[model samples]
Target: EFNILLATDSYKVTHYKQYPPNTSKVYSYFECREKKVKYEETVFYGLQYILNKYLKGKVVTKEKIQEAKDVYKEHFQDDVFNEKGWNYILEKYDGHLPIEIKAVPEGFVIPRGNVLFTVENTDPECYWLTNWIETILVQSWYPITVATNSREQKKILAKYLLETSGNLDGLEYKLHDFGYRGVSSQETAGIGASAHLVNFKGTDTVAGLALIKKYYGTKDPVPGYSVPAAEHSTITAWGKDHEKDAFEHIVTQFSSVPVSVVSDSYDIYNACEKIWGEDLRHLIVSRSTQAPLIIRPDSGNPLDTVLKVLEILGKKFPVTENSKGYKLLPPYLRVIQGDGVDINTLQEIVEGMKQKMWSIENIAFGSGGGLLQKLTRDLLNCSFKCSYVVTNGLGINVFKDPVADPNKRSKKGRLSLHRTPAGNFVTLEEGKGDLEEYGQDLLHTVFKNGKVTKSYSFDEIRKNAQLNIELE
Candidate 1:
């Protein structure tokens, strides 16, 4: 069954029986339990995508419940399906799930170890429904990880860009998302790519842009921008004999705007030194557009390759010194390193340019696996655990303390998020903190009882995330 009723873990089918007979309500919070100093601030993102995509409106139906029952009966080799619970939900709520989800606004960058969102069953009879959907709810990790990694990469670029150029102009397009093909599926591409767009404005993933428009309901028709760029097949098909012509045509035809050509199909050094630098030097310099012609080099030691390509480009281009005394390539020429561009190599490459007195403005980076593929849910060490439950008319706290790993300890009680006087977010467990003493609770009711009670426009999310290069 491809419906929401069957989208949860199989064990969740029998979870209603395990709960206390008098358990009227259950509340749980999703948190990133990361402790590293470097990963303290978790860029909370993509919950909106999940809410709008899977949990919005009336998601459950009688047919879906029957289908789930049949599938589970065969798999478990017994009649352990929750038929009574399904019938109760269908008859009472008219196939709409009775749950409330409170979350920090989608794009807020909250410190790790805080509640990103909390879920609870709204109906007294459906206490088991909260954890039942944990399987799909945990899928928020994909977008959260992508957004955090992308933001971290943006910070890495900013560190060098500010050091070299003394300004953040044009930083929005520095790290391009070359990750569509590398992702596992279309949904992953949509979720992961849009998550990257949460930090940067340039992406080659159209699915990300479309998903943002379709799901987030963005009015900005062009959520991200991409330029015409050549891949290996396009350049290699020309043969090495006509490689110069192919390179020339790239500049000649797309001279009205920015265009990228992959130069490493043959010898990268030969293409950069002789063809791009020596042969087409005048043509590249006289391109009628303000944006640079991008030269891409694939398959080399990333830091070493950047050092070599910039040196090669520096020989032919008019390199100028910025206020920081670092070299900058002309507006008509530039380089993009799309290979081996993980976080460490990205930093190393930027540091290498800084050591060489080359401005970070001379280059941009593109990432595929590093942006989307090379990550896991544990990147943030995210987890969702039941924290508070109303059993027999008494509110009680629940948590797990894994003595083997102190970091795995879960928070307890009816938790609410608060901002300290110094503007740090701290979770107040057991409902002891309120708006009067602890300031306003950060978690707002985003989704409630099959309705999108609160929704965000894409710009609001972008504003929350502090993403616009010029919007600053």
Candidate 2:
């Protein structure tokens, strides 16, 4: 409950210490009495206590401080010290631990599998500390950066799509940040998807609704209460023979609702012109009350298929002349493309298109392993590097020298990044530069002294992402 926010200045490393109760697990301290302190003793309140003792007048109100202290004491004393998993922290950190770490800002674009920073024990003979820090560090950085970058790319594509369709109004409201199970960890899937929503004008995060509400004070307002929100959206079936049964079953279960159907199950062109034909198209357009059927070609080249489908849909459901020849396409017509598309593919489809004819307003995107799979597995060129170690007051540097592949090189020491005017990044020598100086910062302080260094409101992160995409 010590969830109070604190100010941290940019470009300064905030050094911290573990709470006294953290020493309880030491075999030497096994005989020592509890001292009324344990892993769950609430160091956050301890932080306020230190601030109140040292720097009083200008900082926090005594009442607020006492409230935070009381909340921390009650929560920790009642639920954690006697009955929570927090005891495991002391047990886990029984020996010497990594005491010093520095990092760059987060949410910058990085190549696949790159290590943005390093961690090491200051004390000698504490190698066991390395693995614990690894999980914590990767667990923090990977999903945030990846999901943020994905949102950046997707928002850019969405902007172009809306502009191409000649409908820029309310574009953000229709955007969905629904990539939950697509990511690696369930926690990252939730938090990372929420972060993406902040960047784009996304409607909601089905996965991170609770966490978003907890950290950001934003809610999706389902039932006007606290029920968690989720979207069970998926490609129910694919291919030629599969569409009939799958589409029928999906329509039966959901009941004439606004559902997208992938028409290019076999061949987008022939399937529409022959298999689904005019009656199905009329039923989809005239019968369905909500959105029309969305055609997705999983096998064909996406950009080519999208262009072709646009042409076909225009001829089949041409816009009618209202009054003095002002034309508007049917409201229910929609086309979605879901082949092996990524950021680059989306660009190819949206760029240099005739906006009036090549409409994508009704179109949506569905990417699979391409977006959610391991960066190493999908993008072969990128990798993580354990470039250095700081132990026993010694700095051992080891840069990843990939002279054979220049794009694959990784420098040692705590790596930082500088952003370029064109949105590309310049990796700076650790502790050397600012984000604006180069244009981006890669390594970010996620944890320090076993405490969450930054509590990013998911909404803010997502909004920042949307802005980056807009500017990009």
Candidate 3:
């Protein structure tokens, strides 16, 4: 029988079924109720045996195969999976999975119940199977985490101060996504709540730019610059082959520049449009400005509109000798959703017109507050515990917060955090052995002896960020 297992902090996969000190041997079953593999939870529990055995530290490797067998043999003596399944997994995927690396690159604010990362045997052909780990990943990060212990209040206060300063756009990015950069919209705030802020004449361009760039990689146009950097704009409504007046106005106002316009002005299915085979299209190339095109929405679904638009554009602007298929096709056209939008709605719209899906850029999204925040919770500020240390080097000791609240426990004795390659915390362990002196990574190295070590470049950080595995 196939098996599935979930690795998470909420389930206590490792600790409750602790391996004996100095010996990596662990028991299969425990006596506690919550700890037991229940009738409902037992649906895919047997894989734990395979995983635990598979994910061992140095101590586990020391044991002979039979010695490892003895560790599990006692409890699951007559179990079906314990007998046939265990041997089956070991033989089939031998020498595939590796022990996890300690340092993980994850952030604090993950929405409730989402899996940030996952793992499997190294050799896909050797151990090929899949299972649900979202819940485990979601609940795996330190739960009941505080958002910077008041960073929200601080951010709000900062916004208020900046607004009063008259720049109005003061901290625009900070306010838009709760100070989350690189996006135009803030994700869902817990269960369901969106916070709207008043910014520089109420323009959500930062939010718009953030959302479009993050999801579609479409950069909003900013007028006035070099040849390739010419700004782009979009306008949508009904059309009547009166494409001349509109085209003339655009060319005159922007000066043989790049601009976008919507095609389906009136009857989307049968309307005469102007974005096809025009001198301005060729001039866009001769002038070295990006040839922008308009979008069509407010009448049909994004996906449907994309399909019909691409079909029509393809016939009119077929691939040629001078122009590549990509530049000719209007993937750069803006996607303006005039009505009805939420996270799922936007997702469906983009899914319909995914250029990356078809290797062609097609549509970009335009949205306001209503649809922005519903995508996810403000999970960026979650934290486990910022603890303290007391004991010297040897006689270990952990101290609790003198002010005893669940939120203020302040664990003790030189604590250190380990980030998983899968981007989640494994919790704080004793900081004595593995860590460098006085937590050099977090503190001393931050400023160096006085000058500071080489700082990370924005490009390097961006590259590292690209390497970040998305949460499932």
Candidate 4:
């Protein structure tokens, strides 16, 4: 099912015969073209994982070629498939597509409107291969978008924590991932959750952990962490009448470690005040573990809901003042708001907490649809476009410029990304600002003819993402 030959849009299979006559090579670049971009800098990630997992070493072969040919024949209802080009790649390149990809290093927070990556055919005869595979390479938008969102959230919350708590100790685990069930597939959850972990160290999506170990090299076997948490079904299966027993059972069973219980099944305030605060208060406050018994509320407006929960919990438990004068919840008792959380809403929640004199550490968030399902490729206006081509042995720039929408314009000629003396990254296009003359382009050869030229570790990427927050 993951065969590269069958991994493209069907129209791309017939594109070998669609290029300009005598075209020697085609060069294309990827970028985020959002005219009104959300973040000042975009996060570049997951490209290394894609290059290795899908396009790496000896991907093209006789079996995949035959399968693609058969599939396209029946799907397209005609013999438009370029079987000859498939066989040519198999014979000339020995089943390795002859293309070279140069990209910004993974996990950089690049400014919008600059080229993130560029792809070009190495062997002139395989010109069509450059854009033909855009279907797979462009899917990197998902990870990049997810990572950028996660990073922006981290930046905002970091500021609050540093201000209120005067420290960022437990901030790494503040935003837990609850996005697995909300995604479309296992890989979608894995990739998006992995992107989120590039910023923070907590997640409920186990797929993220597995994918990190599988696709990245790191000293830690598990890069992200999760606590035992109960869904509505688990908390209510004892029937609403036994809600306290349900909460008690989960807390007692996972007492040695942290655990989260959804308390909104039947009146979150009643559950927190009567059941947790008055009834089980001793067990929660007396925990030997440093981790908290997290009371989660998945119902009600997250911003309003979290504040009320914090106020109630604050009055019930012992609260201490942090170095910054904000009130801190005891480590054994905390609240997690898991519903209706997006980046902006999350910021608003913290804003509300600050207004109420509560420490940022008193609450954490679990975002599902908001983390993985609430976004699209347009969040960054991610695009892949042909920017240069070698036609009849002469290199000429190629681009798209629609008069109706100037913002849709594409870059021209061979492009290079460079950081200026002032330390701002820029894209030099159409034979201008050649990096060889002054400075080096950020784009480095990452993939070449079915082999990954370079790779990155999860730790390096994590450090790079953290460094990005410093620039702001």
Best by TM-score: 1
lDDT of each: 0.86, 0.42, 0.30, 0.87
For each candidate, how many residue pairs have backbone atoms clashing (under 3 Å)?
A: 0, 14, 18, 0
Ranking by lDDT: 4, 1, 2, 3
Ranking by TM-score: 1, 4, 2, 3
Poorly placed runs, candidate 1 (over 4 Å): 467-472
lDDT of 4 at 472: 48
lDDT of 3 at 86: 26
| TM-scores, all models, native as reference | 0.97, 0.55, 0.37, 0.96
lDDT of 3 by residue, 1-472 (tens): 1122223232232232231233211101110011110111100011121222233322112123344345335534631112232243355544122211121222223222221222322222212111122232232221122112122322333333232222222232222222222234243221011112111111233332332223222122420111212112322221355544554455446644444444455554442233434444542333332444443344576567656655555555532221222323433332234334433454455444434232223333333333233222223322232122112222333335545454433343333333445654333334452554333222112111112222332222223322111211
Give the poorly placed runs of model 2, Cα more than 4 Å off.
Answer: 1-132, 139-145, 155-159, 166-257, 264-277, 280-301, 320-328, 351-356, 377-445, 467-472
The prediction achieving the highest lDDT against the true structure is 4
Instruction: Write down the lDDT that model 4 would get.
Output: 0.87
Report the lDDT of model 1 for residue 394: 95
TM-score of 1: 0.97
Q: How much is the lDDT of residue 6 in candidate 4?
A: 85
